[PDB]
Amino acid sequence: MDVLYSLSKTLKDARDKIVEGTLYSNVSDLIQQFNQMIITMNGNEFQTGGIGNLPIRNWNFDFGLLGTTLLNLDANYVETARNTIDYFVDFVDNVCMDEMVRESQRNGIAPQSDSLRKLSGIKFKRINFDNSSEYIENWNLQNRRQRTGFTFHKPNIFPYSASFTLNRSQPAHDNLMGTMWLNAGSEIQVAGFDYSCAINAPANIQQFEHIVQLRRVLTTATITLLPDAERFSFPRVINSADGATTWYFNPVILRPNNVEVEFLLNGQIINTYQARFGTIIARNFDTIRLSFQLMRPPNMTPAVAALFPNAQPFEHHATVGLTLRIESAVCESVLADASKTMLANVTSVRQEYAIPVGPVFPPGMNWTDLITNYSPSREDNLQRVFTVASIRSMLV
Amino acid sequence: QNYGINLPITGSMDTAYANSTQEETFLTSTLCLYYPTEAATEINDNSWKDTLSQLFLTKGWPTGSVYFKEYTDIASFSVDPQLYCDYNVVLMKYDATLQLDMSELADLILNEWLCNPMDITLYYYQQTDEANKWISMGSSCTIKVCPLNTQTLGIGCLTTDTATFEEVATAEKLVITDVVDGVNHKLDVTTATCTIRNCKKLGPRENVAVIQVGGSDVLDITADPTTAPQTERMMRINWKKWWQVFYTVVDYVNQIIQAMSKRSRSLNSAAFYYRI
Amino acid sequence: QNYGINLPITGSMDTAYANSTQEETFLTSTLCLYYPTEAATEINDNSWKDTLSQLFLTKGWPTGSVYFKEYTDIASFSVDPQLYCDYNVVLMKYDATLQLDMSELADLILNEWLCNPMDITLYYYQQTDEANKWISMGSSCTIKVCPLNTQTLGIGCLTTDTATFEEVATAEKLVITDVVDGVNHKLDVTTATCTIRNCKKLGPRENVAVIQVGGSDVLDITADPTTAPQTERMMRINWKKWWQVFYTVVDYVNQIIQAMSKRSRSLNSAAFYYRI
Amino acid sequence: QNYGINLPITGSMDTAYANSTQEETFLTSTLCLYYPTEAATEINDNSWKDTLSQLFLTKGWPTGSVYFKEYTDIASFSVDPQLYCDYNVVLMKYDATLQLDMSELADLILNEWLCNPMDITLYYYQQTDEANKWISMGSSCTIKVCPLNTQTLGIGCLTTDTATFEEVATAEKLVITDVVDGVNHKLDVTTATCTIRNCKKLGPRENVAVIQVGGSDVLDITADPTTAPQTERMMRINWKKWWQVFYTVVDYVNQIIQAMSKRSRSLNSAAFYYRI
Ligand SMILES: *[C@@H]1O[C@H](CO)[C@@H](O)[C@H](O)[C@H]1NC(C)=O
Ligand SMILES: *[C@@H]1O[C@H](CO)[C@@H](O)[C@H](O)[C@H]1NC(C)=O
Ligand SMILES: *[C@@H]1O[C@H](CO)[C@@H](O)[C@H](O)[C@H]1NC(C)=O
Ligand SMILES: [Ca+2]
Numbered sequence A: 001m002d003v004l005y006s007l008s009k010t011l012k013d014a015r016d017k018i019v020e021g022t023l024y025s026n027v028s029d030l031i032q033q034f035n036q037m038i039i040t041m042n043g044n045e046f047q048t049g050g051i052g053n054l055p056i057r058n059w060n061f062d063f064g065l066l067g068t069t070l071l072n073l074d075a076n077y078v079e080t081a082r083n084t085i086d087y088f089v090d091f092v093d094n095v096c097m098d099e100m101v102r103e104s105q106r107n108g109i110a111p112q113s114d115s116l117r118k119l120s121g122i123k124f125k126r127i128n129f130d131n132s133s134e135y136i137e138n139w140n141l142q143n144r145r146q147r148t149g150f151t152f153h154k155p156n157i158f159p160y161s162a163s164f165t166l167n168r169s170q171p172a173h174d175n176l177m178g179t180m181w182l183n184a185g186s187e188i189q190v191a192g193f194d195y196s197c198a199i200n201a202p203a204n205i206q207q208f209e210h211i212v213q214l215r216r217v218l219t220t221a222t223i224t225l226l227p228d229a230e231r232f233s234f235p236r237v238i239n240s241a242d243g244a245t246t247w248y249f250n251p252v253i254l255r256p257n258n259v260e261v262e263f264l265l266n267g268q269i270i271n272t273y274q275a276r277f278g279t280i281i282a283r284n285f286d287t288i289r290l291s292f293q294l295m296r297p298p299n300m301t302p303a304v305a306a307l308f309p310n311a312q313p314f315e316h317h318a319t320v321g322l323t324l325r326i327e328s329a330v331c332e333s334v335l336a337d338a339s340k341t342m343l344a345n346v347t348s349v350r351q352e353y354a355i356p357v358g359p360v361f362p363p364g365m366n367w368t369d370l371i372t373n374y375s376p377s378r379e380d381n382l383q384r385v386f387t388v389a390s391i392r393s394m395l396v
Numbered sequence B, C, D: 001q002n003y004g005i006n007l008p009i010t011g012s013m014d015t016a017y018a019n020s021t022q023e024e025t026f027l028t029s030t031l032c033l034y035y036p037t038e039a040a041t042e043i044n045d046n047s048w049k050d051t052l053s054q055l056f057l058t059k060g061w062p063t064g065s066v067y068f069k070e071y072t073d074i075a076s077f078s079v080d081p082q083l084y085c086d087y088n089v090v091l092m093k094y095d096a097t098l099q100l101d102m103s104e105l106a107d108l109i110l111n112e113w114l115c116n117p118m119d120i121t122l123y124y125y126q127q128t129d130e131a132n133k134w135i136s137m138g139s140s141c142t143i144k145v146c147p148l149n150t151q152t153l154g155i156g157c158l159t160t161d162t163a164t165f166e167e168v169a170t171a172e173k174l175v176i177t178d179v180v181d182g183v184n185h186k187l188d189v190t191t192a193t194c195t196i197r198n199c200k201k202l203g204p205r206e207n208v209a210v211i212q213v214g215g216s217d218v219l220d221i222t223a224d225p226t227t228a229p230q231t232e233r234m235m236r237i238n239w240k241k242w243w244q245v246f247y248t249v250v251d252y253v254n255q256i257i258q259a260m261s262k263r264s265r266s267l268n269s270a271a272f273y274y275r276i
């Protein structure tokens, strides 16, 4: 991996710095690294595999070294460098693609493709140089049992789930008490509804609780918390739990009461925010506990009092909602996020070459299934393929 | 079921709808049509029940499922009404002079009630909650109420002299009495002629629909003056003949049953649940 | 220009509202007022039509554009009423005894009906869907129906003996008959006295509004028991003097017309759909 | 809270037994004792009810919670007995001549029966499954049955001649009829004198216990010949003096109530299953 990353980095530096007219002193160290790579790779035969529709490709390396005697790079030098760079970049892209479409139940972190296994031999270790990218930095840290960190803008941490729970229900579904929620990528939109508006509830208060257990621990997380769940604020016709019938939701939104957001780590409350909205910081957590209350307004104007009778039928249903949005976070594990393209790249490569479903990832690289069952083996394989994809994105 | 009544039920908002269960509901349920005697008199046919059953069969109800029960008038039907089968459709002829009696009958048969005996000869009684009423029915109900105070002394009525009590009903075949809550009341009732029970309104009754034949929207199934709900089970139609009414009931039976829900039927046909 | 083809319309937001077209419509449209004879009798003036025309001219309607059509009573007006103005307002007096007839008239004029002929002597007839009814009109309609079974035999009736049939109308001048769908009925109607037609309710009729003078909300323009829709075209006004009724009608003609729309079925976009 | 849905319960072992709830149940529940008239006749005391109430109060039952309902004899008590207390104990005297009637009464009160109406004049009836029976009750029930074949023709009977029918009851005040399942029967019943109902046995009724006073084990509350189950709610006592019977009942009220359970159907959980 470090050798493959170093090949990609050397090629990227060559493409960026070996330009017509540039001082040789701008590329002397780069040219030394490039020539070392050529010497190491010369005489070696590589094969990128035939898994799926990915074609079998054979790679032979017999290239001359780049010159050193020029003071400013000219057209001839740049064309020779470009030819060598193009062949090497094609090789690196094919190796990355071959590694991305492969998965092992056991050594998911270890290289899977023949080319990358060969690159892990000692004779190629000399190619290794600056490992500065975030993904390769975390890869090296993970080779040494060191604390890893991946920063995610809007991490895709919650698997998709649009579900509801009824605490009070009847076959007629006309006096209901419960919770609706959508847990999208970085979003938790939850809403507790009471059809009776807590007319018969003790103290005229109905408590609602939502617990979201994250599959990985998030640290240094910025969360925007808003007092309304717009997703559950319009009339809906909703299937029953068994799907045997449909019920009617006609929410009227009330201000959530006694809003308490707890961010917990291993069952211990790390952060607590009461009646706070806007930006909040959750420094280290793996569980979110949103507790809110529907309080019946003790003083009601005639229209409000008209909405909420003392008995059935209940035509307007009281609802209190919260929205939680993780804008940024840090995770010790790789995750999909709104900013990077690693998941997109791996999925695209797997789809383009018709890679049959393997024993590790879910079919089609579906993120919801993958994050629902984010196991250690899946974590190893996913970090491997994401690192390879980041290496490939340097060149392709 | 009972031990898990206080347990959550979780459902996904993407679970595919099941097929229509209306056919299975009809093939396994029983329907009762309550109509007044004047309806059968004006129809003036002895086989009309067979014709209606056959029309219902055309509409999907197996032969034997639909039943027809007759009642003389609103007053008589109110004396301990009995709801016999899974779906009860009550055709109530409207009369502008009996608005309160229609309201009382609709309140009794469109809501669940939990009633207890009232020994008015021995104890004073209170209505603890807005859901608490006193439902009395029989051949003739005449209820006189004397509100008391902390010392049991009647207010505007001497306890011994019933003649000074306050009249709330006279010769009623059914009456739902609602007095001020938190005040003990002495009651004089014609117990020999009619029985009074202390009842609590549990909630709506889904298996009973009331179709008001002719008239306007006058039913008030809730004692609260500020609310006069018109639920989906309170229908109203215009009529010149009863055959048209019955054909309308048969043709739109699917819609009528849609307005009603299953599982609301009780083993007993009584209009309330009695605890002694 | 492309008639008989339904082309999707793909408008957008932010197109900006056009100016009020109310003045242009009043300038280019005609308004018919339908009132009972007792209205003119109580007004007792030979120039009241001219004064109302002038008052409407104060509201924008050009002189000679508002027409005043008179009818004896509801029954006489229910004899195939023809409403030919761009906007029609029917001042209908309320009567507690004629609720169903009022409802039938409103249903007939507040909705669009595609009617085809019925020859009860030649064919048996069934109502295919909930929008199919039998509308009969004339001097006196008496409809008797014999439902048949799959063996083309009467149910509770003999196909040869019309005395055993079931009466759904008597001496009516307009009646809308709804029978159970999917059943063939033999019909005995006084064809010499009135005509029956098989009519499908296409939808609302938008240029006709009904103002119920006095009374309560009793109209039911839908055969469904579960639905009694009060559309914006059904007004209700309490009254003592017909002059006040007409002053209210003229003073809120803006609101009355706003509650109505140009008849879709009688404009060029309806060409080769059913008419015009 | 979640009514109408069967939620699984996932209890565990080692949760530790709770304390005795017997005292709380006696404090909060009511007990009805049903005894024959001859019991009171032999006791011959006008305060025996008060003494038994006091004796029950010694056993934990609050005063005014134990009721004493009287019935003339088994036949009269089998006329739709209404057992409304939280716990019902029926002291039933044994008669060698009334074995089947005793069995029928016990089967009717020791079990739960979901009953729907029967209109023998209009429809033919069949018993679908082994839990389906016909229960008839009233002043006198005489049921005659004509089995039919697939050609809706009587078997050993003429549908038009009820004299050829087969008699299954005569002058009964309560009878449970079990006919061959899957066969349509025409029925001739004295509808004017008594009422019949199509009843499904849902299961045991737990708040009702029957103490057979004298005699042997002769009850059979199951139509199955192969089964004669003696449930824990069927006690038998040998007797000479009714005072001894009542002293035994009060002294072992703990055991009697232990043999019973709160009516599973009559409590909040059964809401939208059948009642409450
Ligand atoms: C439901 O309807 C579908 C479509 O007609 C049919 O295939 C299926 O068998 C039906 N039954 C169930 C249980 O889905
Ligand atoms: C529309 O109305 C505005 C203001 O009422 C007026 O100035 C204008 O001339 C009218 N016509 C058009 C075409 O905008
Ligand atoms: C239960 O019984 C025990 C012993 O009989 C007694 O000490 C205790 O207070 C009772 N109550 C509870 C709640 O354990
Ligand atoms: Ca009354």
Ligand SMILES: [Ca+2]
Residues within 6 Å of the ligand: B156, B157, B164, B165, B166
């Ligand atoms: Ca007084």
Ligand SMILES: [Ca+2]
Residues within 6 Å of the ligand: B127, B129, B130, B132, B178, B179, B180, B181
């Ligand atoms: Ca009260």
Ligand SMILES: [Ca+2]
Residues within 6 Å of the ligand: B220, B221, B222, B223, B224, B225, B226, B227, B228
């Ligand atoms: Ca009210």
Ligand SMILES: [Ca+2]
Residues within 6 Å of the ligand: C100, C101, C104, C172, C173, C174, C175
């Ligand atoms: Ca008419």
Ligand SMILES: [Ca+2]
Residues within 6 Å of the ligand: B045, C156, C157, C164, C165, C166
């Ligand atoms: Ca007939």
Ligand SMILES: [Ca+2]
Residues within 6 Å of the ligand: B251, C127, C129, C130, C132, C178, C179, C180, C181
């Ligand atoms: Ca029809």
Ligand SMILES: [Ca+2]
Residues within 6 Å of the ligand: B236, B237, C220, C221, C222, C223, C224, C225, C226, C227, C228, C229
């Ligand atoms: Ca209607």
Ligand SMILES: [Ca+2]
Residues within 6 Å of the ligand: D100, D101, D104, D172, D173, D174, D175
């Ligand atoms: Ca018997």
Ligand SMILES: [Ca+2]
Residues within 6 Å of the ligand: D156, D157, D164, D165, D166
């Ligand atoms: Ca015989």
Ligand SMILES: [Ca+2]
Residues within 6 Å of the ligand: D127, D129, D130, D132, D178, D179, D180, D181
């Ligand atoms: Ca049987």
Ligand SMILES: [Ca+2]
Residues within 6 Å of the ligand: D220, D221, D222, D223, D224, D225, D226, D227, D228
């Ligand atoms: Ca047996």
Ligand SMILES: [Cl-]
Residues within 6 Å of the ligand: A154, A338
């Ligand atoms: Cl963003």
Ligand SMILES: [Zn+2]
Residues within 6 Å of the ligand: A166, A169, A173, A239, A240, A241, A247
């Ligand atoms: Zn549900």
